[PDB]
Amino acid sequence: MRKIGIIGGTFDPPHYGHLLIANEVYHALNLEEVWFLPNQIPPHKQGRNITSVESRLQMLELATEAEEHFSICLEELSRKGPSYTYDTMLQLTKKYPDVQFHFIIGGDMVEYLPKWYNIEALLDLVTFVGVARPGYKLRTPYPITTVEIPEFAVSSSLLRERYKEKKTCKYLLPEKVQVYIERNGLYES
Amino acid sequence: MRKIGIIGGTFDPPHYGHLLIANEVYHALNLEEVWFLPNQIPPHKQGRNITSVESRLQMLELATEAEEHFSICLEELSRKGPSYTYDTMLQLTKKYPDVQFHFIIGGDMVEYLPKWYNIEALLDLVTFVGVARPGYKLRTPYPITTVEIPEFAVSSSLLRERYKEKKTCKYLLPEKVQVYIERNGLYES
Ligand SMILES: Nc1c(C(=O)Nc2cccc(F)c2)sc2nc(-c3cccs3)ccc12
Ligand SMILES: [Ca+2]
Ligand SMILES: [Ca+2]
């Protein structure tokens, strides 16, 4: 009966956009906590740069360390290459039979839910939480919860480009993440 | 091989945002045509409304009628249930052996490509075209083509809330589609 949120992604890098979404859902739905679920990234086909699991995990640590109700879930990182959400949620529900998982997704992704691997069985494992801007209404045959979220146009691709151009990203992600990015020379070609 | 774009989605309703994306990719990559690929929607779990196949197809016709280089592909819509993209593209590849398919996806979708059903096999059937805001880049282990398109922010979920509130959506989607929506009482739920 414990209400726990799940927010998945590569977190490459983690930013205030992610934290804002996790916080809003935590508060809207009265969750006990939100788990950040870092995805595996397959090796690059052409051997080009991917952000190491080590780096993504430490940025997540730094991003969430000051937040009481945010935790990191290592389930997806703990085996294989990438996992279907079904596979991950199967293991978490078996592992935490007392938890009601609330799986947070962007509004734009809602229309594509019928294409998710093994969707019908996943619907028995999680409650989906669709996030949408004020003024936006989500539509789906599936029983999802909608949460309205403020606009802050920060994205990982934005931040990556700023670091490439040796610009600062003050005010866009936690200070400690920024220091890590700068010290490890991340995202600079 | 003929270069053909694929833009998939529920188009519920189709609007200027979709046409802008298709058109930009069409011009950027010198495609012969862009085929809009309407998805199937499973029946509502709680007996509520989904927009019919008939309605979605006719809005799509009205949205694309003026453009020679825009067509509608019925591969998914003619089926009884939803299709994985891999299964659709395998059939299309089979049916059109001289076509190189360019599969258009939103920038936000790129991060989650490793979770798509049969992604490795699908990579051998299509070239993905990711849409980035101008000056921004997409990060993925997969070989993808990037097309820059401004984020125009018009969305189906905005238009639907507007129709529920009994507003017009003039200047946000083709005139003909707005008429069809109003005349048929779509999006009032
Ligand atoms: N299979 C998935 C998606 C998908 O099929 N998208 C899509 C996008 C454009 C056209 C299309 F046919 C499908 S979006 C998505 N998001 C996720 C997420 C994982 C964690 C947060 S969202 C997992 C799987 C998929
Ligand atoms: Ca730097
Ligand atoms: Ca009406």
Ligand SMILES: [Ca+2]
């Ligand atoms: Ca009515």
